[PDB]
Symmetry: D2
Subunit: 337 residues, 4 copies
């Protein structure tokens, strides 16, 4: 279970094997977004550099590679938000507090069109960032696209609360794998990430098309891909910070698997994601050239959120920094004794 | 029968992405168009007409990042495949099994067989194929040289089946599966994928290439091309009296009208897309490095299909400027014919 | 006099880069070629012949990142300009200074004067300029509207001087500097730069634009097109009895052979490259913000000349497929007469 | 003078105003190259990270933006070499040691096809890197190109010995401006950098064209532009590390200029660089299309080496880190008390 290394499945196969396309504005937007998030959070010279080495701009730059600079900056901001946001439910104050967790979720969701107050970086730094994002989204999105951003952020928040229920309910190692995947499909944040990317991309497929089971499964697959990849790469962080929400921990602790057998099962599910993906595009009806052009762009987005995460996962300072390249090159991921 | 028909959307599913066209299109086109005009002795009129066929447009979407050189060889191959195939459709080989199979036997001989050095003077069409083969040979591994042979073979083979059916009175007795089996070969998509693997510089291992899922992808690209072609070149096959067209077969085999035949073709085009993804679902992974190129090869299948699509609406060989109007309006006119 | 001539290298220095061609060329060519054909009532033959003139190629290199609709706009303007200018070279206004003036009057009045809403039916050529001007007006500032007008006026003015020199019998008494003066206007490059500012979305402040440095860049680009055109349009000017060609002028005034005249043209072309660089030497800075667009503007000046260069060697209007051979071999054949 | 902040001249005007193009292989070559120098030099996690923040890949990715991945990695290596090498003569043990400085350039020049040993990371890490770059250069360059490689590096090495001679001979503040620039045209590393770029871009103009005074002057201007830009941005580093090689230090302590009046002189020099650039290009003869095509790519390399340094200077963790983007925005560069 706790061997000196674990042999990682190939995460760069199938639809993940292509050369990632990185937004050419990455450098400009990182410069603006990194410094802005530092002033907002009041990060010091060393905390600001530590965040800058996390490079959330690499992640967003791959999600929406032809986004214009100003929207990529927005994508960066939103990412800093979700990172600062999610950590409150994983390591921060909302981890074992159902009441406060639901109250943060109600307060954050009312930002988007509701009765929330006007936040400032002083009044509530993280809710401000999300609110600065919403305002920009609202200002260049159809009301239907705005509704989609809400409803997808809502799917993330809903699971966050199921996450804190299972946490305090001692369900973290009772829940089966389907229950865990169902939780993470929301708490991974791919569903609002895709909405963010539709904003950056400038792609607005009609809600009826969007709602088709094929495209919903494309989103579901991409969310599974991110979660499988994330639970491998960020496993050491989950050990170092005591977070149980990791499929490797779940498969060892619940099914008596060896760390290596665990990772192996992750590789089985990853490649079974690729099979579901294609099988789901086979059901995708056609809506004529005009719309299908953007449906394809959308399907690319679901792909890009997953591959953008994969490549970002293997080099971000938040997980393994420069050590992730060695794991990429040799499949060997060292563990802590 | 009808003055026009509503053609099905051919630019849906995967065909709907914005095509990429090789930036070298212009310089490769000015060279290779002049070249084939010298080889074939095209007077000004016939050479201008051939440029308006714009096979360079076709090649420029099969391999959009092919370098100028390889792109010129590709234009060379397409001018070959068109002058060659016409011999079997309207030319001297259309009703001549013996003369067809001697032509096939002598063209195959060019790819390493006992073939002589052809010249533009001695044999102009066989010459172009030799020039392509020379260039293919000098930058390809032996496994890809073979693949190129084996894929041309699949095309050459159905050529001979096509001429047997033609003389054998089978043209309108063959059922739709028999026809598509035939056109999968005679459409030339299999040799075109080998031509593009050359242009794009993608050399997938043969044990991978041979997997039934990639095979099915080559097969779907072929059906897509045969389907789109039959609907576009339909006026040509009428004007020139060629029976090898799913429209004429659906109308003369089953009693469907023009509209219903083209509707059937639309259904089949969308069944292609379903078969595409269902095939991709069975494609296994060979690790990052190979899968990377596998992905490039799948794209080559798509780009052949999509390159044919956009070209078929542009080419003067079919509808010329009125193919743009068919893309704009869905209306494809038919001749009075009586 | 000779069976051919050796043309100097017209593709050196700033002309020697690989041209960038708007990747919307095909989609734009399809629309605009068809469009002008309906307007001018071209029949199958004339329409295809005009399609082989491929003004879309020419426009696609002036503004290689113009969106499809501005490219079509530029194609329409090119089709205009060629129809329009031909009235002055071999058409009716060729020898008529009254009718020529009236035409120049009526056309200028399209641009916010008292011109009637033309129609393909009433006046096709004027219909095309007016369809252009409407599009130029809707997306350009009032300053750029004036600049478009003002630049076309330089073109129109020399047209009137042209008809004055045809009727005045000074087509071969005039000198080269007088001829270059005229052609700098009649060549149409000044409004073609205005068209390109529209196409490429570049809006340099007028006090910058008016700096002698930038005006000499336009002068140079216009000279390049004129020298290049006179070499490649030479066979046409012989076919259609047009006297406006430096080739023809150099042989009458100076007792120059065809070869040494084209060689003078090569000598002048390389002088443009030196005037180009000398003029940029004099170009002040207005800070990164503006300088970024002046640099695009200088490129637009370069792209009109270079686009003209490649189009001149491909178009069916001049040498068609033979032009490619003159670029491969430097030999241009001349008519036996 | 010693103000609290200086207003830096607009460093991004003229030919520096274009949007810089950054090699898409930036992300892959960086991940390779950063880890590689980390291993070679035994950097620890924090030293490695600080080197990643130097982001020397960003600097090379702008020198040859279409260089394939493997050549970009080489370029990164060379840059890691150049910095580790150049600091030995600025802050290191060779800063004041004429005999050992000459022995270093003698041991290093002999790596390029001479009687040098086969270095390894362990025996001599920095010389090992230069050796690895040189083996790659030789493998894919012509003899003439390799000789150019050697001759441009010798220009760097020679001036390094002049720098150490002036340091110890107490001439650091006696040498006039021209002496200083003539020294830095060598020690700034631009000449070998252009050479490194000819390799990365695959551009091999012939030496008879290369030696033309126009192109030699183009390289000079590139060299001055980096020196000027360097002395401005690396002024705080020179203060903090006690290095007298900086035009700002010279102007103040040699003449009578304040630290503000110093940058002012940089600003006039920087814009005079632009003037010289165009005057040299005016004198550049044409060598026919085929050659001129590559000459312009080379003139671009000259420009790109400067413009690459410019953007990298304002991002590097080596100079101002995050505060450089503020100095780009505002033109205010704070100094220590
Ligand atoms: C829960 C969000 N997440 C998951 C790794 C960490 C804060 C970032 C993320 C969001 C969207 C897509 C991919 C990653
Ligand atoms: C018979 C080959 N074909 C089919 C339309 C006509 C000459 C050209 C072609 C070859 C390969 C792919 C697409 C078209
Ligand atoms: C206006 C005359 N000209 C010159 C060849 C032919 C009709 C068009 C033109 C205008 C501007 C740039 C390039 C060509
Ligand atoms: C000595 C040169 N420098 C900064 C001027 C320090 C290592 C790197 C550099 C090399 C080449 C071009 C630009 C910067
Ligand atoms: Mg979480
Ligand atoms: Mg977490
Ligand atoms: Mg995690
Ligand atoms: Mg056929
Ligand atoms: Mg046929
Ligand atoms: Mg057909
Ligand atoms: Mg004319
Ligand atoms: Mg004229
Ligand atoms: Mg002319
Ligand atoms: Mg130093
Ligand atoms: Mg130094
Ligand atoms: Mg310094």
């Amino acid at each position: 279970k706790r061997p000196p290394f674990v042999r990682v499945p190939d995460l760069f196969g199938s639809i993940m094997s292509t050369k990632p396309v990185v937004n050419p504005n990455y450098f400009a937007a990182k410069a603006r977004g990194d410094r802005w998030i530092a002033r907002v959070m009041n990060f010091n010279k060393a905390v600001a550099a530590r965040n800058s080495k996390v490079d959330l701009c690499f992640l967003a730059s791959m999600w929406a590679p032809d986004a214009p600079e100003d929207r990529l900056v927005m994508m960066l901001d939103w990412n800093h938000w979700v990172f600062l946001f999610d950590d409150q439910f994983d390591e921060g104050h909302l981890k074992e507090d159902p009441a406060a967790a639901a109250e943060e979720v109600k307060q954050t969701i009312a930002i988007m069109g509701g009765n929330a107050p006007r936040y400032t970086a002083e009044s509530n730094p993280i809710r401000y960032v999300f609110q600065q994002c919403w305002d920009r989204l609202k200002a260049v999105s159809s009301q239907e696209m705005q509704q989609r951003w809400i409803d997808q952020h809502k799917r993330y928040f809903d699971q966050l609360l199921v996450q804190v229920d299972q946490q305090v309910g001692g369900e973290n190692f009772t829940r089966d794998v389907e229950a865990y995947m169902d939780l993470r499909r929301g708490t991974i944040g791919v569903y609002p990430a895709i909405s963010l990317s539709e904003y950056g991309a400038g792609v607005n497929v009609p809600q009826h098309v969007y709602d088709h089971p094929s495209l919903q499964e494309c989103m579901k697959v991409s969310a599974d891909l991110v979660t499988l990849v994330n639970d491998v790469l960020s496993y050491r962080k989950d050990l170092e910070l005591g977070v149980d929400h990791n499929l490797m921990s779940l498969l060892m602790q619940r099914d008596n698997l060896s760390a290596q057998q665990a990772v192996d099962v992750i590789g089985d599910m990853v490649n079974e994601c690729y099979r579901r993906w294609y099988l789901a595009l086979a059901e995708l009806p056609s809506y004529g050239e005009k719309i299908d052009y953007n449906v394809m762009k959308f399907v690319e987005i679901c792909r890009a959120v997953a591959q953008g995460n994969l490549y970002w996962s293997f080099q971000t300072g938040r997980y393994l920094g420069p050590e992730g390249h060695e794991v990429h090159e040799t499949g060997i991921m060292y563990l802590p004794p």
